[PDB]
Amino acid sequence: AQYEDGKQYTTLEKPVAGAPQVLEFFSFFCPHCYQFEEVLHISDNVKKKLPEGVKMTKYHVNFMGGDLGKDLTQAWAVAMALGVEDKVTVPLFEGVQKTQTIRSASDIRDVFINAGIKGEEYDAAWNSFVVKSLVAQQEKAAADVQLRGVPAMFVNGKYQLNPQGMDTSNMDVFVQQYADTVKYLSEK
Template sequence: MWLVLVCAVVAVGAFFIWSNSSTPVNADSKPTAVSSSAVVASSFQNGKQFEALDRSATEEPQVLEFFSFFCPHCYDFENVYHMSDEFKKQLPEGGKLVKYHVDFLGGELGSQLTQAWAVAMTLGVQDKVAPLIFNGIQKTQTIRNLDGIRQAFIEAGVSGEEFDSAWNSFIVKSLTAQQRKLAEDVNLRSVPSVIVNGKYMVKNDGLDAKSVEGFIQEYSQVVKYLLGQK
């Protein structure tokens, strides 16, 4: 319960402060243009917009996003604010966007979803599977067990045999363990969370939350700034 509340606090602090705005926000909303000059990179500070972790930076530029299919704010992060698309725009040549699932929401099913996400990464079907699982968990509540997860993969074009084979493979078990270990190493307690270059965690509650446009713009600019840090 505490962890669920943390997820909610993150969202209230970072996403929904503008909920009293006269303009409703929905999946079809298009952010209005905001001049890049409105965001001054030199004003970004450790402890305010981001936190420097006691870790070595990755050799290549990287944006790592932690999420949970059980977290409604992760759903919005991906499907309403399209933050993954924003991050991709900021990646330099050779950079990559990585998404890891967390175990601390959803009990046993949450743990199975972390392994399922490892299957998706192994088969290269993340973009096809993610909307189906988000919908099955949060909208239709049709994914309640491993069979429901398997069916989502089948709907995404993966055969049942492919899923079963990948589920029990060494690479999937390794990727599952890797997701869990990194979340533990950075003492992750809330989602969505973004770590840039393996060393800098964006502080959602330190960003402009007066408007959807301002939040998206500043988040994107902070990530761009951190991609240039080592």
């Protein structure tokens, strides 16, 4: 066939009931995640091709960058709660991987302040129980699929994207292949 299990995707032997439709996992410490976000714009090109009525979820993971890695998952929780994902994603990636000016929770906070979120509003979010269960959600979802690597994408708690089985000669072609695969898996 054209799309085959083990080729453009793998199947979970242990399917996750009630999982979000399109589920992406990343880390601001993850070099391919930086590529996926800033160079390839994967999340975005997938969205562009999903049949609509399908919602996209992206979560941060703990298993990279030790203590800062966890701070980053809480900060991504804050980001989701405030709806400012689109304003901090790029300065968080560049602060962690490009300029390396993010070394502490306080530096993470600076990114949000500079993006225009107010100090009081950030600190309030940061410390809120609505942020704590949102952290819990990110951790539960990664736990449910035994996640040990990022970037990772899962469709309907049963299929996992397998980007190693796609041509990387051209970056545009890779993105479209990746996105069409998500759309196929989505219609499955």
